Design an enzyme around this catalytic site. Structure first.
Site, short mmCIF file in Angstrom:
data_model
loop_
_atom_site.label_atom_id
_atom_site.label_comp_id
_atom_site.label_asym_id
_atom_site.label_seq_id
_atom_site.Cartn_x
_atom_site.Cartn_y
_atom_site.Cartn_z
N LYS A 95 8.22 2.50 -7.54
CA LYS A 95 8.28 1.53 -8.56
C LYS A 95 8.18 2.31 -9.71
CE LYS A 95 4.74 -0.81 -5.66
NZ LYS A 95 3.89 0.24 -5.35
N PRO B 293 10.20 -1.88 7.57
CA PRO B 293 9.13 -2.10 8.37
C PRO B 293 8.42 -3.23 7.85
CG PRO B 293 9.62 0.12 8.35
CD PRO B 293 10.38 -0.47 7.12
N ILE B 294 7.83 -4.06 8.60
CA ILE B 294 6.93 -5.16 8.12
C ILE B 294 5.64 -4.67 7.87
CG2 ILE B 294 8.24 -7.11 9.00
CD1 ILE B 294 6.07 -7.24 11.05
N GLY C 144 21.79 -4.70 4.11
CA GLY C 144 22.09 -4.41 5.50
C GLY C 144 20.77 -3.49 6.27
N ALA C 145 19.94 -2.84 5.30
CA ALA C 145 18.89 -1.96 5.93
C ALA C 145 17.90 -2.86 6.35
CB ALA C 145 18.76 -1.25 4.85
N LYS C 146 16.95 -2.39 7.32
CA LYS C 146 15.58 -3.05 7.84
C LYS C 146 14.59 -2.38 7.41
CE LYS C 146 18.19 -4.31 12.05
NZ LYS C 146 18.07 -4.14 13.54
N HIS D 109 7.73 -2.36 -11.32
CA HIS D 109 6.56 -2.59 -10.81
C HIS D 109 5.95 -3.87 -11.52
CE1 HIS D 109 2.89 0.32 -9.70
NE2 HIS D 109 2.63 -1.15 -9.44
N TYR E 274 0.53 5.73 -9.47
CA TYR E 274 -0.58 5.87 -8.70
C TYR E 274 -1.12 7.46 -8.56
CZ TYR E 274 0.74 1.36 -6.63
OH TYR E 274 0.91 0.28 -6.60
N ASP F 94 4.29 2.65 0.74
CA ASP F 94 4.36 1.96 -0.72
C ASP F 94 3.70 3.06 -1.67
OD1 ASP F 94 4.97 -0.25 -2.37
OD2 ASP F 94 3.02 0.12 -2.73
N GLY G 257 3.34 -1.51 6.10
CA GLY G 257 3.65 -0.16 5.33
C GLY G 257 2.13 0.40 4.90
N1 LIG Z 1 2.97 -3.96 -6.97
C1 LIG Z 1 1.44 -4.12 -7.52
O1 LIG Z 1 1.21 -4.34 -8.35
C2 LIG Z 1 0.49 -3.75 -6.59
C3 LIG Z 1 -0.63 -3.88 -6.94
C4 LIG Z 1 -1.98 -3.82 -5.79
C5 LIG Z 1 -1.54 -2.91 -4.69
N2 LIG Z 1 -0.24 -2.79 -4.70
C6 LIG Z 1 0.10 -1.90 -3.35
O2 LIG Z 1 -0.49 -2.65 -1.93
C7 LIG Z 1 -1.51 -1.61 -1.44
C8 LIG Z 1 -2.62 -2.35 -1.03
O3 LIG Z 1 -3.42 -3.03 -1.89
P1 LIG Z 1 -4.88 -2.45 -2.41
O4 LIG Z 1 -4.73 -1.08 -2.23
O5 LIG Z 1 -4.94 -3.13 -3.78
O6 LIG Z 1 -5.97 -3.13 -1.47
P2 LIG Z 1 -6.16 -3.53 0.21
O7 LIG Z 1 -4.93 -3.01 1.14
O8 LIG Z 1 -6.12 -4.78 0.04
O9 LIG Z 1 -7.52 -2.98 0.27
C9 LIG Z 1 -7.85 -1.37 0.32
C10 LIG Z 1 -9.19 -1.35 0.60
O10 LIG Z 1 -9.60 -1.79 1.87
C11 LIG Z 1 -10.31 -0.49 2.44
N3 LIG Z 1 -9.99 -0.87 4.01
C12 LIG Z 1 -8.64 -0.63 4.64
N4 LIG Z 1 -8.58 -0.70 5.63
C13 LIG Z 1 -9.88 -1.26 6.01
C14 LIG Z 1 -10.46 -1.81 7.21
N5 LIG Z 1 -9.60 -1.64 8.70
N6 LIG Z 1 -11.86 -2.05 7.17
C15 LIG Z 1 -12.66 -1.95 5.90
N7 LIG Z 1 -11.96 -1.66 4.89
C16 LIG Z 1 -10.58 -1.39 4.81
C17 LIG Z 1 -10.01 0.77 1.75
O11 LIG Z 1 -10.97 1.65 2.15
P3 LIG Z 1 -10.61 3.28 2.34
O12 LIG Z 1 -9.13 3.41 1.68
O13 LIG Z 1 -11.42 3.98 1.76
O14 LIG Z 1 -10.66 3.28 3.81
C18 LIG Z 1 -9.78 0.27 0.30
O15 LIG Z 1 -11.14 0.21 -0.29
C19 LIG Z 1 -1.84 -0.68 -2.68
O16 LIG Z 1 -2.44 0.50 -2.15
C20 LIG Z 1 -0.48 -0.56 -3.14
O17 LIG Z 1 0.15 0.30 -2.37
C21 LIG Z 1 0.75 -3.01 -5.52
C1 LIG Z 2 -2.97 -3.42 -10.57
C2 LIG Z 2 -3.36 -2.10 -11.21
N1 LIG Z 2 -4.01 -1.87 -12.51
C3 LIG Z 2 -4.14 -0.63 -13.17
C4 LIG Z 2 -5.13 -0.15 -14.04
C5 LIG Z 2 -5.56 -1.53 -14.97
C6 LIG Z 2 -7.19 -1.68 -15.09
C7 LIG Z 2 -7.52 -2.91 -15.72
C8 LIG Z 2 -6.57 -3.86 -16.49
CL1 LIG Z 2 -7.33 -4.99 -17.11
C9 LIG Z 2 -5.19 -3.59 -16.41
C10 LIG Z 2 -4.77 -2.51 -15.36
N2 LIG Z 2 -5.57 0.98 -14.18
C11 LIG Z 2 -4.93 1.93 -13.46
C12 LIG Z 2 -5.59 3.25 -13.61
C13 LIG Z 2 -5.11 4.35 -13.01
C14 LIG Z 2 -4.12 4.24 -12.11
F1 LIG Z 2 -3.82 5.19 -11.35
C15 LIG Z 2 -3.63 2.66 -11.73
C16 LIG Z 2 -4.20 2.03 -12.65
C17 LIG Z 2 -3.60 0.39 -12.16
C18 LIG Z 2 -2.35 -0.02 -11.49
O1 LIG Z 2 -2.16 1.26 -10.61
N3 LIG Z 2 -2.82 -0.96 -10.37
C19 LIG Z 2 -1.94 -1.09 -9.43
C20 LIG Z 2 -0.49 -1.61 -9.48
O2 LIG Z 2 -0.13 -1.87 -10.78
O3 LIG Z 2 0.32 -1.37 -8.61
#
Ligand SMILES: NC(=O)c1ccc[n+]([C@@H]2O[C@H](COP(=O)([O-])OP(=O)(O)OC[C@H]3O[C@@H](n4cnc5c(N)ncnc54)[C@H](OP(=O)(O)O)[C@@H]3O)[C@@H](O)[C@H]2O)c1
Ligand SMILES: CC1=Nc2c(-c3ccc(Cl)cc3)nc3ccc(F)cc3c2[C@@H](O)N1CC(=O)O
EC number: 1.1.1.21
Length: 316
Positions: free
Chosen positions: A78, A14-15, A10-12, A111, A49, A44, A17
């Site tokens: 997570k 934000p698209i 039932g919560a909303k 996660h 992290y 997120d 984050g």
């Molecule tokens: N559940 C999971 O396993 C998982 C895995 C991956 C990611 N996530 C979540 O998803 C989030 C987003 O994914 P991500 O961090 O992998 O990468 P992303 O959001 O696709 O890309 C982040 C990168 O893009 C740059 N950037 C951001 N806005 C920009 C813009 N307007 N113009 C140019 N460059 C820009 C950032 O630089 P600066 O920060 O230096 O500005 C950073 O290097 C993560 O931070 C995390 O919260 C979850």
């Molecule tokens: C996709 C992913 N991979 C890893 C990995 C990672 C790097 C390489 C490989 Cl093959 C598998 C996992 N290293 C991390 C080191 C520090 C940290 F804060 C986060 C590290 C993470 C992890 O946070 N991240 C993002 C995620 O799982 O959301």
């Protein structure tokens, strides 16, 4: 475009984050302060992290400034892979709550489906570089997540990086207490996730798109890797709308009824990334962006490809 999507509790939600993976502790407090100032209400987070205290500082400051109240925020974290044992889940959640300075999370995700050996190291390795798994399973970890809702620590629970069969295993669990509210998965024009999105949306599970910009800061990137932000075809779509490529990449999942969580620590980009409610991608733009799919993952968890619960052997 309504700014929130209804979840099964039932919560909303934000698209749009703010992502926080790779936001260094010495820079992420200011990023979250700026994000809240410009309108973000969803952050997120994750224990892995290594920056949840600094996120929590920023949130506490903005609450004390009277900028926002807690109920208007949507805070996600997570459960890391080393805490999948049922007896470790609550402590992991409470550590996250303590670091974030919160008394509840709006959403808590498993996660990854893979459990790792418990211990201090986040990616425990053997002497040959294989991830050391734990003797844990999805359904038992899910039951431990459900307890967190029943005790008021979290308002909703979900999953991340689960394939459709792993999702189905939870859905079909005898004695299921809560369905997953969300599956958070990688999604962008090079990995469009058509089948898994269709599956989740048909089961009443909201999908969050992670790495929407292609995670150019990911630590294993190779120079020859495809680069979404540099793609001249997407640049051309952006130019036509007087927007940046990043803005197109964020608007894209929004028009697929997804949640999206772009990360930045750069104040100008934090603001840029939120300014995506004032334009529309056309039918042709959507079709064109979808056509860039290559099934190409930036987050493939390559050290875990022999884990019993590795999610990416299945087609979707
Ligand atoms: N559940 C999971 O396993 C998982 C895995 C991956 C990611 N996530 C979540 O998803 C989030 C987003 O994914 P991500 O961090 O992998 O990468 P992303 O959001 O696709 O890309 C982040 C990168 O893009 C740059 N950037 C951001 N806005 C920009 C813009 N307007 N113009 C140019 N460059 C820009 C950032 O630089 P600066 O920060 O230096 O500005 C950073 O290097 C993560 O931070 C995390 O919260 C979850
Ligand atoms: C996709 C992913 N991979 C890893 C990995 C990672 C790097 C390489 C490989 Cl093959 C598998 C996992 N290293 C991390 C080191 C520090 C940290 F804060 C986060 C590290 C993470 C992890 O946070 N991240 C993002 C995620 O799982 O959301």
């Amino acid at each position: 475009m309504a700014s929130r999507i209804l979840l099964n509790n039932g919560a909303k939600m934000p698209i749009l984050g703010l992502g926080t993976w790779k936001s260094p502790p010495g820079q992420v407090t200011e990023a979250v302060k700026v994000a809240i100032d410009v309108g973000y209400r969803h952050i997120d987070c994750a224990h892995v992290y290594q920056n949840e205290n600094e996120v929590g500082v920023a949130i506490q400051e903005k609450l004390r400034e009277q900028v926002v109240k807690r109920e208007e925020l949507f805070i996600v974290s997570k459960l890391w892979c080393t805490y999948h044992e049922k007896g470790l889940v609550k402590g992991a959640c409470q550590k996250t709550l303590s670091d974030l300075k919160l008394d509840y999370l709006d959403l808590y995700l498993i996660h990854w489906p893979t459990g790792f050996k418990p211990g201090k190291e986040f990616f425990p390795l053997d002497e040959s570089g294989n991830v050391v798994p734990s003797d844990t399973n999805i359904l038992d970890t899910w039951a431990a997540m459900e307890e967190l809702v029943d005790e008021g620590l979290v308002k909703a629970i979900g999953i991340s990086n689960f394939n459709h069969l792993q999702v189905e295993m939870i859905l079909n669990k005898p004695g299921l207490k809560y369905k997953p509210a969300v599956n958070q998965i990688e999604c962008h024009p090079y990995l469009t996730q058509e089948k898994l999105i269709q599956y989740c949306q048909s089961k009443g599970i909201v999908v969050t798109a992670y790495s929407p910009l292609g995670s150019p800061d990911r630590p294993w990137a190779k120079p020859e890797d495809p680069s979404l932000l540099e793609d001249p075809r997407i640049k051309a779509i952006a130019a036509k709308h007087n927007k940046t490529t990043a803005q197109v990449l964020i608007r894209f999942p929004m028009q697929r009824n997804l949640v999206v969580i772009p990360k930045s620590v750069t104040p100008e980009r934090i603001a840029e990334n939120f300014k995506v409610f004032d334009f529309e991608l056309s039918s042709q733009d959507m079709t064109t962006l979808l056509s860039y799919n290559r099934n190409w993952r930036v987050c493939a968890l390559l050290s875990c490809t022999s884990h019993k619960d590795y999610p990416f052997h299945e087609e979707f």
